[PDB]
């Protein structure tokens, strides 16, 4: 399912396609205008075309044409059968180059899918003062989380671990400086430590690297 991007908007889709993509690049994503539907976003002629994907509950189609049991069957059909997809009274639209849904960084401090409870246990057991990692937010899909071990090296303290939301909408923490990359945000906060409301300084001293 490389070409599927779970947590993006139509504007994000355009950005990826225009930045990482070439003509013929495409991806699928959830519909924002019609929750439960899906959307095919395709790059052609330097621009991006969005195409509604109907999800009836029983099948998927493009509001016409062939019907499919799964979203992946639909997408694979149109990739495999050049000429089956076209603009009405328009050109054939080629699904040539899938735009893969990639992690926001390759740094080993990024743990991807990891819950707060799971992050607390890893940092508590394998971290020490100032150990940190970044993970996906489970309660805010598309956002990220900086989880940091605080205070002395003891197992018990309140949790030994603080979690700070990183908005992705470009990346910020709580409406401060906006960064073009997660790596850039982490670099910044390593050098200029954030301070929690209640007064602890969150120094990012060493990563707790994934063993994944």
């Amino acid at each position: 399912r490389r070409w599927f991007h779970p947590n993006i908007t139509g504007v994000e889709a355009e950005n990826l396609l225009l930045t990482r993509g070439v003509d013929g690049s495409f991806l699928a994503r959830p519909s924002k205008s019609n929750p439960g539907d899906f959307t095919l976003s395709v790059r052609r002629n330097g621009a991006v075309t969005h195409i509604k994907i109907q999800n009836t509950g029983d099948y998927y189609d493009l509001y016409g044409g062939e019907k499919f049991a799964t979203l992946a069957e639909l997408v694979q059909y149109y990739m495999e059968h050049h000429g089956q997809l076209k603009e009405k009274n328009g050109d054939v639209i080629e699904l040539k180059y899938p735009l893969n849904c990639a992690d926001p960084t390759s740094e080993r401090w990024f743990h991807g899918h990891l819950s707060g409870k799971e992050a607390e246990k890893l940092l508590t057991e394998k971290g020490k003062h100032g150990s940190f990692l970044v993970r996906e937010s489970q309660s805010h899909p598309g956002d990220f989380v900086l989880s940091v071990r605080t205070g002395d090296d003891k197992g018990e303290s309140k949790s030994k671990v603080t979690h700070v939301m990183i908005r992705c909408q470009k990346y910020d923490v709580g409406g401060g400086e906006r960064f073009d990359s997660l790596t850039d945000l982490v670099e910044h906060y390593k050098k200029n430590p954030m301070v929690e409301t209640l007064g602890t300084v969150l120094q990012l001293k060493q990563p707790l690297n994934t063993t994944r």
């Binding site: 409870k117 607390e120 671990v161 603080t162 979690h163 700070v164 939301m165 709580g174 401060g176 409301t197």
Partner: peptide
């Protein structure tokens, strides 16, 4: 014993 999920902390 109930254990709630960790909360997010405000900063800066």
């Amino acid at each position: 014993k109930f254990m709630p999920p960790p909360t997010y902390t405000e900063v800066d």
